[PDB]
Amino acid sequence: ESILKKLEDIKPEQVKKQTKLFRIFEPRQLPVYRANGEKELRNRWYWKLKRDTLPDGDYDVREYFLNLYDQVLTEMPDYLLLKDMAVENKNSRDAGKVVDSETAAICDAIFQDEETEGVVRRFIAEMRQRVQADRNVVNYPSILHPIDHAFNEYFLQHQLVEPLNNDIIFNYIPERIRNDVNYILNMDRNLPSTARYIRPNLLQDRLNLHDNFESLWDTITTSNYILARSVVPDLKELVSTEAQIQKMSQDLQLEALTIQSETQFLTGINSQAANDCFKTLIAAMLSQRTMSLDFVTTNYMSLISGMWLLTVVPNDMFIRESLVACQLAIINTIIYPAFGMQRMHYRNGDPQTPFQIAEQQIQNFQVANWLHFVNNNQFRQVVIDGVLNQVLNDNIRNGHVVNQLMEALMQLSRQQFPTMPVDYKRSIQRGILLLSNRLGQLVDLTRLLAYNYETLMACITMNMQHVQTLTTEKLQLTSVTSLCMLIGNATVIPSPQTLFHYYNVNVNFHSNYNERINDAVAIITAANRLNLYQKKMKSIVEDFLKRLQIFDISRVPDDQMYRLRDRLRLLPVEIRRLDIFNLILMNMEQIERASDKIAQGVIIAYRDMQLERDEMYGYVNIARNLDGFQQINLEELMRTGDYAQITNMLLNNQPVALVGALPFITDSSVISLVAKLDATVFAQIVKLRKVDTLKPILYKINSDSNDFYLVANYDWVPTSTTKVYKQIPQQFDFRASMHMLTSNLTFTVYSDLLAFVSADTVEPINAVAFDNMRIMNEL
Amino acid sequence: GVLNQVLNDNIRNGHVVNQLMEALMQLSRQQFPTMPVDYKRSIQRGILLLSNRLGQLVDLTRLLAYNYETLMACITMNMQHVQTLTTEKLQLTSVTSLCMLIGNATVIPSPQTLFHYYNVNVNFHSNYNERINDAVAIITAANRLNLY
Amino acid sequence: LVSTEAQIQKMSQDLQLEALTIQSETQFLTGINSQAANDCFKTLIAAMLS
Amino acid sequence: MDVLYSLSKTLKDARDKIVEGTLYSNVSDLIQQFNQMIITMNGNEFQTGGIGNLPIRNWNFDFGLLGTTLLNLDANYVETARNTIDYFVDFVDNVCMDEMVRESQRNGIAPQSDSLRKLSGIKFKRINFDNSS
């Protein structure tokens, strides 16, 4: 089946390993200039963006930072061992190591450079790793920008690996499987103190998909049903179908020349149907998938088998119409004719089931008592080991309800059927006799069903929610008759390997569900906090559903995806993702202001302002802040398209600051500055009513300028009427950028803990139930 | 100077759809005492089909009201409300299509579309008034010229 | 507009009309398409305007 | 006060109606109300205070629901119900005694004991039923 392939193909979680330190910045050599703009012989190292690709426009900058958040989440590891990143520092006095190779490249470049101070070279020569083998720790020197250091330190200090030992592996098994005397567990390895593992995230459904997402819940329950069917054990040593058919024929006294109801009693009795019924019942209860009853009213054996089925299975497991039809057939074919009561005229849509009316109307104590039990047999909602489970009545689990049903049936057999021909009573008696010749087998079968159900229920990790599903699983009542007539004395219980496989599939699905929820929640919350008002989030949710691997997103409308978005939006963000986003939020302004492609704005003043002195520029018309200037937001202007204010300010020469991520032209020409070209780039705003084409001029006046002699020969400090709202790069201080990154020296991470557990079963003949008695007790 | 037929403000902002949602959410919780249960389930699931599109229906109501107001700004003759002889037949299946297929793509009248609509309305109104003037002038002249 | 195929399959799955005993099983979801949605939008706004 | 009265009324109805041999239809609504009370009280810790010589008493509710399976109530059912009812009656009597021995000048109509103050929270409003006294 394709559904089973999709569900069992899910892998636990791709474990992420870090191979290099995450870096947004790198050192870079730049020429420096004196206060008068003359080039100094020495160069200087500055922090620059490694990949300077920030876009134009504030909205696109926030989009860039959402994309960077996605990148960091991708690069964040589950664990880290720094020795894997460690490389030789060739200038180390002790021939030690540093992390990563990028740090080694920086160290080599700084050490070999002739302009480096000898103190920096001493410091590089002192850079080596320290191993504390007793604590299983190692520290490595690294050269990182403060933001790079923050991110990498967060990765180091928030790894997902935990210590692994034999006790943890054993406790990974569900508590009910360990508490079961029918299974013997064994291990042949002592896991070392350096063993590690990653816990699955088994949080219970935060989206409550069982509530109002009926199509998605139908898909989930169908997947669960298919998996449960795959794990439900097969019935062994069933009674021979031919022998049982012969015995049933002898008991029914089939007559060749007469048309008889009893003939149909043999319809559809085979081992395939028996196994199908067993699997359907246990799988439907495990997945909590609604069942539908299929039967032919002319088959009275189907009705007696349905009496057993409604005795043992809580009636909310059946779609209401099918349950009502089956109960009405039972009442009008067996019970009321037995007691001489007028046929029940049952209305479709009655608030009461036929059995409730019959219970109120039947004066026989045994029949009415069994009717009352069937009416009130419900699942019990119980949280066991943190998972909500649907638990059967203890009298179902031990099989005493079978005795109550048999008492009712024996009372029915003793009735006279006053208003019926005697052959009708004979047919009903023959059906009851077929059922009651296997009373011990029925008790055994009820106990076996209950035991298999609870044993496989121990392997469910997600809450078992009892809600009627959109579609049903059809259960044929002839299959129930087959199971009742052909079940032998062979006890079949889930294999320990089957239990572990089922539990592992459930854990994989649950962990994937929770991890994808976390991813979607992080992305949605980040996009909301980054004010991405033009972003339609459907894609996110679409991706989310695609990664659950069991839904066909082509069948999911957009309204449902946006309802999922609304539910996800209310969940808190996972701690690691939330902290990473907090770092990005805290440092995004500094990351953006480091870009050489964009400026943070342009101040249009209409007075001469002396160009600022900055060693890495000479003279430059940079504004460190927008103080003393009215601010026009370029993003709001582009969104609203109303250019009246900016047009009026430009036409009236009113000083202003146009604020927003802008590209700029770098112009080193002194003549261009004297020509006042930077003030000529704003008339196009008035002409075309567009600011996406705005590209202010950034003057860079220094000795590399062709006409720098004018600055030199006239004691003249350059002045401009326009300034570029921009920041200057931060100097690279080698000593300040050195951080000792600490990690564990070595450990081994393990994926499948149950691989270390070998489990076997006791002899099935000696397998016991919750009440300490054997599951099956017939000879 | 133009009479206009305007909507309740709760329609314009789309808030009343919530009330509709509330109402029909209640209808999804009702027992339907004597109804057969499969038909009851089908009705309740259809009610929920409309209910679960609350955001889409609020957006649709706001879009419809905004488009109506914007195009009504372009009307020049009084919007007189009279029950007409013949009607425009509206299929409720088309209403179902609109309710179940509307996304979140805002569509507003183009400025050129608004100007064209306003120009056609102005031309029709002016021609109406001018032809009234011509007819009245000729009738009055014929009467005052005693053209019995 | 929402994909007509997706919405139609969703509505069919939710309504479970085939499982009912409605004499008109096919006619239930007929007329549900983008053309009908556009026609409804136009008809409503135009009727209110005129 | 209405929640405390409803607890006492449910307990009185249980004592009067949960009797051996009675039809379950005579107690169905009462059993539902009693199970609602059990659900509402479960997981809640109460303390009846030590004002005067009244002993300080702690109350924990971890009771299972009453059964719905018997057509007629038998002796086992009545015994289990008796155990639960006895604990609840002790709790209600102690809460009433704690409330009776207290008084306030500012708000004398409001609850004075901490148990009755807790029972005035919304989570217990489910317990409230027929107020006919």
Side-chain angles (χ1 to χ4, degrees):
Chain A
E1 189 144 13
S2 49
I3 290 156
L4 191 67
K5 190 71 178 300
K6 288 210 291 179
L7 186 56
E8 281 176 338
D9 275 8
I10 297 162
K11 296 298 300 187
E13 181 67 5
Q14 183 54 287
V15 181
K16 309 290 288 191
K17 252 199 78 167
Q18 203 174 326
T19 54
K20 61 166 184 289
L21 298 167
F22 174 73
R23 291 176 190 262
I24 290 157
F25 294 81
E26 51 186 358
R28 179 174 302 155
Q29 257 200 7
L30 261 47
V32 283
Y33 304 89
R34 301 196 178 111
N36 61 357
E38 293 175 358
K39 207 217 179 212
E40 280 269 31
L41 180 55
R42 279 132 52 229
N43 294 307
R44 197 142 295 179
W45 289 91
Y46 281 92
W47 284 117
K48 287 289 172 187
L49 295 178
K50 288 182 71 58
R51 301 308 186 94
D52 188 5
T53 61
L54 269 85
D56 287 318
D58 276 338
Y59 191 96
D60 279 3
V61 168
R62 262 129 56 213
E63 272 178 325
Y64 164 100
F65 281 110
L66 185 83
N67 181 256
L68 178 70
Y69 180 44
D70 192 273
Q71 280 168 323
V72 177
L73 291 183
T74 290
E75 277 294 358
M76 174 158 71
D78 305 5
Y79 69 91
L80 193 149
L81 291 169
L82 281 170
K83 71 180 184 296
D84 293 333
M85 299 188 199
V87 300
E88 165 72 336
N89 172 13
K90 64 185 66 153
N91 306 294
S92 180
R93 180 204 293 276
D94 296 331
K97 284 202 166 67
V98 294
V99 299
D100 51 358
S101 60
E102 211 275 7
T103 282
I106 291 164
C107 287
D108 298 339
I110 297 288
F111 195 99
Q112 259 49 72
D113 170 27
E114 73 291 338
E115 290 159 353
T116 296
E117 292 303 77
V119 68
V120 173
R121 288 204 199 85
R122 289 167 178 282
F123 186 82
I124 287 154
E126 298 321 313
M127 280 172 77
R128 58 153 295 169
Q129 79 288 33
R130 261 57 189 79
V131 183
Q132 308 161 354
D134 50 309
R135 304 209 300 105
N136 191 45
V137 173
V138 61
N139 312 269
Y140 287 97
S142 72
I143 293 295
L144 289 172
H145 182 88
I147 298 159
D148 297 341
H149 164 71
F151 276 108
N152 286 298
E153 206 199 47
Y154 192 88
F155 298 159
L156 280 160
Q157 286 160 331
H158 298 83
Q159 302 177 41
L160 303 169
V161 286
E162 323 90 20
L164 175 67
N165 47 78
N166 277 27
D167 161 86
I168 276 158
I169 290 167
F170 221 88
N171 290 334
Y172 185 63
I173 300 161
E175 203 286 313
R176 276 130 98 200
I177 306 307
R178 302 190 257 103
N179 187 271
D180 201 332
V181 299
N182 293 339
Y183 301 102
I184 288 285
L185 316 172
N186 205 345
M187 301 178 71
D188 65 333
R189 295 289 186 266
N190 285 125
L191 273 288
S193 52
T194 44
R196 296 287 183 278
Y197 82 111
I198 294 148
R199 277 152 149 276
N201 177 9
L202 305 186
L203 280 170
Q204 290 305 340
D205 191 8
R206 289 164 286 168
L207 297 183
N208 301 287
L209 294 178
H210 64 97
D211 170 64
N212 206 37
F213 284 97
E214 280 215 60
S215 321
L216 306 176
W217 191 247
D218 206 60
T219 303
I220 289 157
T221 303
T222 297
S223 306
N224 285 328
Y225 174 77
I226 296 308
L227 182 71
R229 278 197 81 87
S230 77
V231 294
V232 163
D234 284 79
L235 303 169
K236 286 157 83 279
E237 312 173 17
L238 286 182
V239 176
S240 162
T241 304
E242 299 88 343
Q244 195 69 359
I245 288 296
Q246 282 172 230
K247 190 218 186 297
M248 291 172 86
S249 294
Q250 294 152 10
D251 305 336
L252 294 175
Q253 283 220 339
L254 300 180
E255 296 191 318
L257 295 320
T258 308
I259 303 294
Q260 304 191 285
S261 298
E262 295 99 319
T263 300
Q264 302 314 121
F265 297 2
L266 307 177
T267 289
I269 306 302
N270 64 94
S271 58
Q272 226 294 296
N275 265 279
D276 169 67
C277 166
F278 197 70
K279 278 178 209 319
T280 303
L281 292 180
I282 293 157
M285 288 188 305
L286 282 167
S287 67
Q288 284 295 294
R289 194 147 173 73
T290 314
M291 275 184 288
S292 192
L293 294 167
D294 198 326
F295 66 96
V296 161
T297 42
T298 72
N299 198 339
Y300 304 162
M301 205 56 231
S302 281
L303 297 181
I304 291 137
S305 286
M307 291 164 90
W308 174 84
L309 175 73
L310 299 182
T311 309
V312 301
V313 186
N315 282 19
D316 278 339
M317 283 306 302
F318 301 106
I319 196 80
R320 171 90 171 185
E321 48 260 53
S322 85
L323 178 80
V324 156
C326 183
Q327 284 188 2
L328 187 63
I330 288 159
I331 289 305
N332 281 340
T333 307
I334 299 97
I335 315 296
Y336 278 25
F339 290 108
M341 301 170 63
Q342 198 151 295
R343 177 176 263 255
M344 179 184 288
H345 176 27
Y346 183 78
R347 263 82 147 187
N348 197 352
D350 197 316
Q352 288 201 292
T353 65
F355 274 11
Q356 286 160 339
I357 300 161
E359 185 209 323
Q360 281 172 262
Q361 285 293 118
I362 286 281
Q363 313 317 332
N364 182 278
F365 176 74
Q366 293 88 333
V367 172
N369 202 39
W370 169 80
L371 282 167
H372 185 95
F373 176 88
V374 170
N375 289 332
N376 300 282
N377 174 26
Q378 269 99 44
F379 275 120
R380 193 173 91 244
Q381 287 220 144
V382 195
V383 188
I384 307 171
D385 309 320
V387 193
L388 177 63
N389 294 150
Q390 308 296 342
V391 169
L392 289 162
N393 185 282
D394 271 315
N395 293 131
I396 296 161
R397 301 174 66 217
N398 60 31
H400 201 60
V401 294
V402 178
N403 296 120
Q404 194 204 53
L405 166 71
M406 205 53 50
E407 282 147 6
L409 292 164
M410 288 306 97
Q411 279 311 292
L412 294 160
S413 322
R414 288 164 176 279
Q415 300 317 311
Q416 303 319 315
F417 294 68
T419 66
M420 307 304 271
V422 300
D423 54 284
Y424 184 94
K425 170 177 178 272
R426 198 172 55 171
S427 311
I428 302 303
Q429 275 191 305
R430 272 163 182 177
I432 289 164
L433 169 59
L434 285 177
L435 196 73
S436 76
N437 277 348
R438 299 181 61 72
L439 164 58
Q441 282 83 25
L442 274 175
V443 175
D444 280 354
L445 174 61
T446 309
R447 290 160 65 78
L448 181 79
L449 271 164
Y451 175 82
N452 271 269
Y453 171 61
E454 74 209 351
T455 313
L456 288 162
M457 182 159 66
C459 297
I460 281 162
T461 66
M462 299 187 86
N463 280 336
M464 299 172 59
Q465 302 289 351
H466 196 3
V467 57
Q468 295 249 313
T469 65
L470 258 179
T471 53
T472 48
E473 305 299 333
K474 206 56 148 152
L475 178 68
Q476 285 165 260
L477 271 184
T478 46
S479 309
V480 182
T481 311
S482 303
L483 185 57
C484 292
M485 292 299 105
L486 300 174
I487 194 73
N489 54 265
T491 307
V492 294
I493 65 169
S495 162
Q497 290 70 39
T498 302
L499 291 170
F500 292 174
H501 165 79
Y502 189 46
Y503 175 68
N504 275 327
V505 170
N506 289 330
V507 166
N508 285 346
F509 183 86
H510 200 172
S511 282
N512 184 73
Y513 182 62
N514 276 321
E515 290 300 80
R516 302 298 78 73
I517 284 161
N518 287 346
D519 290 328
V521 169
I523 295 160
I524 285 155
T525 303
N528 282 329
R529 291 223 269 163
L530 289 172
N531 189 33
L532 296 174
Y533 49 82
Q534 315 186 299
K535 166 146 175 140
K536 298 181 187 284
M537 282 177 170
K538 185 177 79 174
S539 176
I540 293 152
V541 182
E542 182 245 356
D543 280 6
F544 163 71
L545 282 177
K546 280 188 297 198
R547 295 280 308 276
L548 297 181
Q549 287 148 304
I550 58 142
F551 310 100
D552 179 46
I553 55 155
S554 92
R555 292 310 201 182
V556 178
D558 314 49
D559 41 282
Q560 221 178 12
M561 285 191 195
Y562 277 105
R563 273 174 59 230
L564 285 168
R565 196 278 308 277
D566 306 336
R567 291 213 191 174
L568 286 154
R569 190 165 47 189
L570 295 171
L571 302 174
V573 178
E574 188 269 328
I575 182 57
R576 269 159 97 250
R577 294 173 181 83
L578 180 66
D579 290 337
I580 289 299
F581 190 62
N582 283 332
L583 280 168
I584 286 170
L585 273 173
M586 179 172 188
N587 299 124
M588 58 187 280
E589 188 234 34
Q590 203 186 321
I591 288 157
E592 188 213 338
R593 272 144 193 244
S595 157
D596 288 334
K597 283 166 55 47
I598 50 164
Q600 279 60 60
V602 60
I603 286 164
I604 314 169
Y606 296 83
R607 54 187 174 82
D608 309 334
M609 307 177 293
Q610 72 188 111
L611 268 62
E612 198 179 59
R613 298 184 181 92
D614 287 293
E615 57 177 346
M616 80 300 292
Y617 290 117
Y619 286 110
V620 70
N621 62 316
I622 281 181
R624 309 290 192 89
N625 53 76
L626 309 178
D627 282 338
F629 290 103
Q630 190 183 352
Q631 292 185 33
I632 281 167
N633 192 255
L634 292 168
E635 180 179 353
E636 163 268 323
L637 174 54
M638 284 179 293
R639 188 176 58 253
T640 71
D642 178 51
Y643 282 69
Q645 166 166 6
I646 190 161
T647 303
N648 169 261
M649 289 193 82
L650 284 163
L651 281 176
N652 282 111
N653 303 330
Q654 292 171 335
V656 71
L658 308 181
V659 189
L662 280 168
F664 61 96
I665 303 170
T666 291
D667 175 49
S668 70
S669 175
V670 173
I671 296 302
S672 290
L673 172 61
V674 176
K676 301 162 171 291
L677 293 194
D678 65 342
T680 68
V681 311
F682 306 102
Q684 294 304 92
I685 296 163
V686 165
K687 179 166 152 58
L688 307 169
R689 285 192 295 277
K690 305 289 283 176
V691 282
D692 56 357
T693 301
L694 179 58
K695 205 179 166 75
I697 306 307
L698 187 272
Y699 294 113
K700 192 168 148 57
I701 304 304
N702 52 67
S703 56
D704 292 338
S705 303
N706 305 137
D707 290 304
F708 182 71
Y709 66 95
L710 291 158
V711 174
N713 289 354
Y714 295 87
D715 68 272
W716 170 65
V717 171
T719 43
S720 179
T721 54
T722 298
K723 266 200 262 270
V724 180
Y725 180 39
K726 192 92 165 63
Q727 304 302 118
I728 60 167
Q730 295 300 300
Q731 292 173 125
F732 166 61
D733 186 342
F734 190 94
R735 263 96 57 71
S737 314
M738 209 293 302
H739 300 91
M740 295 305 291
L741 304 187
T742 309
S743 94
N744 284 109
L745 175 57
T746 188
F747 50 65
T748 298
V749 192
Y750 295 87
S751 328
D752 182 34
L753 308 197
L754 295 179
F756 287 105
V757 181
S758 80
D760 61 312
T761 313
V762 303
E763 181 74 328
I765 201 76
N766 288 317
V768 300
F770 74 106
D771 64 341
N772 310 326
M773 304 302 115
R774 274 162 193 79
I775 299 156
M776 294 196 135
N777 283 276
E778 285 287 287
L779 293 178
Chain B
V2 186
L3 167 68
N4 281 1
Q5 308 287 345
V6 298
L7 299 155
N8 184 293
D9 263 11
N10 286 322
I11 288 150
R12 303 175 65 208
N13 62 22
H15 184 76
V16 72
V17 180
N18 292 276
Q19 188 50 42
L20 166 68
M21 177 273 300
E22 227 67 23
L24 48 73
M25 221 145 54
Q26 184 63 51
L27 294 168
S28 79
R29 296 187 292 266
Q30 281 304 113
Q31 281 299 347
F32 291 74
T34 61
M35 188 161 281
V37 288
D38 57 326
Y39 198 82
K40 176 201 165 182
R41 277 198 322 273
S42 202
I43 293 207
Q44 291 179 316
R45 266 147 189 168
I47 285 160
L48 279 157
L49 279 173
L50 186 71
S51 205
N52 291 333
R53 305 201 94 240
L54 164 64
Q56 288 73 47
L57 289 166
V58 170
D59 285 351
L60 171 60
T61 311
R62 291 158 65 72
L63 184 78
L64 197 161
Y66 176 87
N67 269 277
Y68 174 65
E69 295 161 71
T70 319
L71 289 164
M72 170 167 65
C74 305
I75 283 166
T76 66
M77 297 181 84
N78 286 335
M79 305 174 64
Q80 303 286 353
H81 179 284
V82 180
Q83 283 272 317
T84 63
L85 292 172
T86 62
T87 56
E88 298 308 325
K89 189 169 244 60
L90 176 73
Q91 309 298 333
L92 278 192
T93 53
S94 310
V95 183
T96 308
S97 320
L98 185 60
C99 284
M100 300 304 299
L101 298 180
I102 190 71
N104 47 34
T106 299
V107 296
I108 68 177
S110 156
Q112 289 306 314
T113 306
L114 291 170
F115 288 0
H116 170 259
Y117 188 43
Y118 180 65
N119 282 330
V120 172
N121 286 331
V122 162
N123 284 344
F124 182 86
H125 196 174
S126 269
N127 181 74
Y128 181 64
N129 279 315
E130 288 299 83
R131 301 295 77 74
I132 286 162
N133 286 343
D134 285 326
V136 168
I138 295 300
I139 287 164
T140 302
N143 280 329
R144 294 215 221 292
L145 282 168
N146 193 30
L147 297 179
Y148 43 79
Chain C
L1 293 182
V2 177
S3 166
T4 299
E5 169 267 310
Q7 193 63 275
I8 287 283
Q9 185 271 328
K10 173 77 170 61
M11 292 179 76
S12 273
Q13 198 194 1
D14 224 24
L15 291 169
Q16 301 272 317
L17 304 168
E18 76 301 325
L20 288 169
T21 56
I22 309 314
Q23 57 211 12
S24 288
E25 304 288 6
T26 295
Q27 306 185 338
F28 215 88
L29 299 185
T30 56
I32 305 300
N33 51 87
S34 65
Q35 184 164 319
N38 258 282
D39 169 78
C40 179
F41 197 67
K42 279 184 207 322
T43 286
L44 293 178
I45 290 160
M48 289 162 65
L49 282 165
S50 63
Chain D
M1 188 77 90
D2 61 345
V3 166
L4 175 63
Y5 170 88
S6 292
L7 290 166
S8 163
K9 189 78 185 317
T10 304
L11 292 160
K12 195 191 167 251
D13 269 312
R15 264 152 151 204
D16 299 348
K17 283 148 155 257
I18 297 171
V19 298
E20 183 185 333
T22 196
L23 263 167
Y24 185 80
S25 40
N26 284 326
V27 283
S28 296
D29 294 322
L30 181 276
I31 292 314
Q32 287 305 85
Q33 164 66 33
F34 193 98
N35 282 337
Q36 168 84 101
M37 170 184 79
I38 295 280
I39 281 137
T40 310
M41 298 295 297
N42 268 353
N44 285 284
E45 225 278 311
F46 288 85
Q47 199 180 74
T48 41
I51 188 188
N53 280 352
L54 260 173
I56 274 147
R57 279 191 100 169
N58 288 283
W59 308 92
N60 292 271
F61 295 81
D62 194 40
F63 291 94
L65 295 201
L66 256 50
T68 305
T69 284
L70 310 178
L71 184 75
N72 287 95
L73 301 191
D74 65 336
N76 304 327
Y77 192 96
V78 172
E79 283 307 89
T80 286
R82 272 210 220 297
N83 204 243
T84 303
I85 292 158
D86 291 344
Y87 189 85
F88 270 80
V89 167
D90 215 52
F91 163 77
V92 163
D93 158 72
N94 267 255
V95 167
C96 286
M97 276 190 296
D98 198 37
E99 191 65 21
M100 287 151 85
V101 296
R102 287 168 200 287
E103 70 224 77
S104 201
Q105 283 193 133
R106 191 37 70 78
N107 295 284
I109 204 73
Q112 310 311 320
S113 75
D114 61 354
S115 279
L116 202 57
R117 210 141 33 206
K118 173 140 159 255
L119 284 179
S120 50
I122 59 170
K123 73 159 106 80
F124 300 101
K125 249 276 156 186
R126 301 287 197 72
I127 286 154
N128 188 217
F129 87 130
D130 178 20
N131 305 333
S132 47
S133 100

